[PDB]
Structure 1
Amino acid sequence: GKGKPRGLNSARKLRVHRRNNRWAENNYKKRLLGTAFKSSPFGGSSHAKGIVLEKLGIESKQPNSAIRKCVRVQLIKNGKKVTAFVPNDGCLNFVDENDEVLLAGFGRKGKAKGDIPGVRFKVVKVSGVSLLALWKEKKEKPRS
Structure 2
Amino acid sequence: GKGKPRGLNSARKLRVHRRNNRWAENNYKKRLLGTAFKSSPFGGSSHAKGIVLEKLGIESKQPNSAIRKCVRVQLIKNGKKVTAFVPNDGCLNFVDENDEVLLAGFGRKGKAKGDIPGVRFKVVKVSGVSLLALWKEKKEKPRS
Coarse TM-score class (shorter-chain normalised)? 0.7 to 0.9
**Does the 8 Å contact 2:57/2:70 carry over to 1?**
yes
User: 1:110 Cα deviation (Å)?
Assistant: 5.6
- Structure 2-normalised TM-score? 0.88
Give the corresponding residue for 1:61: 61
Partners of 2:17 and 2:43 in 1: CA distance: 32
User: 1:76 Cα deviation (Å)?
Assistant: 1.2
Against the structure 1 CA distance between its residues 98 and 136, is the aligned structure 2 distance closer, same or farther, given a 3 Å change threshold? same
Give the corresponding residue for 1:99: 99
Root-mean-square deviation (CA, aligned residues, Å) is: 2.0
**Does the 8 Å contact 1:108/1:118 carry over to 2?**
no
Percent identity, please.
100
What SS does the aligned partner of 2:30 have? helix
Is there any run of 5+ residues in structure 1 with no aligned partner, and where?
Answer: none
- Structure 1-normalised TM-score? 0.88
Partners of 2:32 and 2:139 in 1: CA distance: 43
Name whichever structure is richer in helix by fraction: 1
1:81-127 Cα shifts (integer Å, max 9, x gaps): 11111113224544512111100111464655554423111100111
Partners of 1:107 and 1:65 in 2: CA distance: 23
User: 1:21 Cα deviation (Å)?
Assistant: 1.2
Partners of 1:10 and 1:66 in 2: CA distance: 63
**Does the 8 Å contact 1:84/1:119 carry over to 2?**
yes
Is there any run of 5+ residues in structure 2 with no aligned partner, and where?
Answer: none
